[PDB]
Amino acid sequence: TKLADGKYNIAFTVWKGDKDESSRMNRYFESPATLTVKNGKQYVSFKVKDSTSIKSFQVEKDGQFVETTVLSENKKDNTRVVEFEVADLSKKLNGKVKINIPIINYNASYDIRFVF
Ligand SMILES: [Cl-]
């Protein structure tokens, strides 16, 4: 059941945090993600669109949301690559996104789930 070391692509979709429905956050998170399996551990990374608007992206780690790691940024196309470890790919991962639209007092939070 445990994946061999190496790099893979893994498709994913985003559900709403509290409903079994597709989340609007799908448009910002590019599937497939990259899965890096190294020394048993599993690291997921993927590109985020409209990066400047996605002020915060956290995933739940030990019953608490923690900011994801930024591996790189591309200011030209307004994207960035985020990364986090996932212990169990068969489970839905809880996440939180803070969306900021400066063109107007607009600052809202989205609860989401990653489905691999
Ligand atoms: Cl469920």
Residue numbers in the entry: 31 to 146
What does the paper say about this structure?
B. anthracis, a Gram-positive pathogen that is a potential weapon for bioterrorism, secretes two hemophores (IsdX1 and IsdX2), that acquire heme from hemoglobin and promote bacterial growth in low-iron environments. The heme-binding pocket is enclosed primarily by a 310-helix (residues Arg-54 to Tyr-58) on one side of the heme and a long β-hairpin (β7–β8) on the other.
Overall, the backbone structure of IsdX1 is similar to the solved structures of NEAT domains from S. aureus, albeit with a unique surface charge distribution close to the heme binding pocket. The backbone of the 310-helix in IsdX1 is fairly well-ordered even in the absence of heme. The integrity of the 310-helix without heme could be due to the hydrogen bonding network between Ser-52, Ser-53, Arg-54 and Asn-56 and Met-55 from the helix making van der Waals contacts with residues in β4, β7, and β8. Additionally, there is observable electron density for two side chain conformations for Met-55 within the apo structure, where one conformation is pointing toward the center of the heme binding pocket and the other away into the interior of IsdX1. In contrast, there is no conformational change observed for either Ser-52 or Ser-53 between the holo and apo structures.
